Amino acid sequence: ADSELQLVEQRIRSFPDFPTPGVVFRDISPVLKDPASFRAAIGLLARHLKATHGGRIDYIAGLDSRGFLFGPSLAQELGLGCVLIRKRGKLPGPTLWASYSLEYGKAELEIQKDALEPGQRVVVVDDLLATGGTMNAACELLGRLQAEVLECVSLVELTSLKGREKLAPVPFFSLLQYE
Amino acid sequence: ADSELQLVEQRIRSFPDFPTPGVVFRDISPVLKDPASFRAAIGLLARHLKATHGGRIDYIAGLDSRGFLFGPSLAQELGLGCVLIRKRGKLPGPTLWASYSLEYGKAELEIQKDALEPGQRVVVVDDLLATGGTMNAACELLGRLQAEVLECVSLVELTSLKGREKLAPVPFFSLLQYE
Numbered sequence: 001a002d003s004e005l006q007l008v009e010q011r012i013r014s015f016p017d018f019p020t021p022g023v024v025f026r027d028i029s030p031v032l033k034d035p036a037s038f039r040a041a042i043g044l045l046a047r048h049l050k051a052t053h054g055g056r057i058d059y060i061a062g063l064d065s066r067g068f069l070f071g072p073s074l075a076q077e078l079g080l081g082c083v084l085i086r087k088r089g090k091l092p093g094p095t096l097w098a099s100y101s102l103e104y105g106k107a108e109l110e111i112q113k114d115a116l117e118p119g120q121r122v123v124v125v126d127d128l129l130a131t132g133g134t135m136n137a138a139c140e141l142l143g144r145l146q147a148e149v150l151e152c153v154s155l156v157e158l159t160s161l162k163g164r165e166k167l168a169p170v171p172f173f174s175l176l177q178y179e
Numbered sequence: 180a181d182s183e184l185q186l187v188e189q190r191i192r193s194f195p196d197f198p199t200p201g202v203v204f205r206d207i208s209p210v211l212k213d214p215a216s217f218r219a220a221i222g223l224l225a226r227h228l229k230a231t232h233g234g235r236i237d238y239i240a241g242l243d244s245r246g247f248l249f250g251p252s253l254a255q256e257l258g259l260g261c262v263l264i265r266k267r268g269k270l271p272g273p274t275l276w277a278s279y280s281l282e283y284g285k286a287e288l289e290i291q292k293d294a295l296e297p298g299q300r301v302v303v304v305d306d307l308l309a310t311g312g313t314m315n316a317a318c319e320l321l322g323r324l325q326a327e328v329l330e331c332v333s334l335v336e337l338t339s340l341k342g343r344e345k346l347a348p349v350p351f352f353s354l355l356q357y358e
């Protein structure tokens with residue numbers, strides 16, 4: 001297409017009634033499949049984070065499983081490591097658990113108790129923000145490790161679901177906004 | 180440590196009796212957390228694939244969820260796109276299903292029916308090869324899309340579990356070998 005944002009815009013596809021009726025699933029697979037689109041997405045997020053936080057970011061935290069697609073490249077682009085926040089029963093050793101029952105489903109996440117040392121500054125990444133249940137659970141886990149969450153970011157945001165509100169005062173940034 | 184392989188070697192940690200008794204879990208999280216280690220791992224895999232297959236690779240296929248950590252960066256390093264092979268119930272639209280009951284668990288995977296066009300050449304990546312049940316299920320799905328699997332690769336291989344044998348004649352390559 002041309003601009004960096006354009007290359008990301010044109011690589012979302014939509015599937016209605018998935019996983020349940022009335023829900024439009026937004027699939028980032030075309031972004032992964034087109035190496036120009038992927039690079040553009042990582043570049044846009046990286047440039048935002050660098051302009052916004054300077055050199056204050058210690059780690060990116062990627063959310064299982066689609067956040068895992070972006071976290072490592074985003075971290076690498078910023079010269080940083082990536083830590084993992086996982087779905088239930090994935091992680092070995094001591095962990096912290098966050099289990100939220102929400103109106104539309106559950107957000108159940110875990111993190112290794114030694115994933116971060118206290119005072120470390122982190123940016124969370126996932127593919128998509130909807131209600132904010134998931135990212136909110138991630139911020140809870142990180143705060144219980146005494147990490148500071150600088151910002152959460154995603155490729156896609158569903159604005160009618162008020163995810164940004166739920167996360168406030170933690171800053172939020174997305175590339176693309178749909179209803 | 181120093182050599183590229185060294186930087187990967189020193190970033191595996193082990194947790195015994197997880198997820199079940201007698202099983203040693205090999206955790207690649209330290210690789211992700213140390214940006215030098217991650218870059219070294221991607222570089223080693225990329226250089227092997229480039230030396231081995233020339234320009235014949237069309238896509239990397241990453242396995243959900245830990246293969247997702249490496250697939251995108253490996254693809255990017257080779258100038259290629261990454262396609263996704265997912266656990267059950269993740270993907271929207273038409274899919275192919277592979278469900279294997281194995282002595283020690285199940286390998287249940289899915290791929291979008293349009294993930295690839297017939298004749299496309301693919302390398303599969305995951306964090307770790309054990310029995311080969313998972314990668315074998317992935318190769319089945321790719322073959323049913325009439326894709327050619329050039330090779331499967333991983334960071335870690337558990338050699339006592341004969342994963343390489345199970346995959347043969349599909350070539351296999353790992354960075355690190357444990358019993």
Ligand SMILES: Nc1ncnc2c1ncn2[C@@H]1O[C@H](COP(=O)(O)O)[C@@H](O)[C@H]1O
Pocket residue numbers: 023024025026027063066107126127128129130131132133134135163
């Ligand atoms: N409409 C959607 N399409 C694709 N993924 C979604 C959608 N809604 C929720 N998700 C996934 O669930 C999480 C965001 O939902 P939420 O916790 O409500 O913010 C992310 O991990 C998304 O990948």
Ligand SMILES: Nc1ncnc2c1ncn2[C@@H]1O[C@H](COP(=O)(O)O)[C@@H](O)[C@H]1O
Pocket residue numbers: 202203204205206242245286305306307308309310311312313314342
């Ligand atoms: N001992 C292990 N430590 C970490 N992951 C494992 C281990 N064994 C199996 N896996 C995971 O399960 C898959 C490989 O098991 P297999 O299908 O038996 O080759 C990969 O997705 C691995 O991430």
Ligand SMILES: [Cl-]
Pocket residue numbers: 064086090244245
């Ligand atoms: Cl995982």
Ligand SMILES: [Cl-]
Pocket residue numbers: 065066243265269
């Ligand atoms: Cl997924």
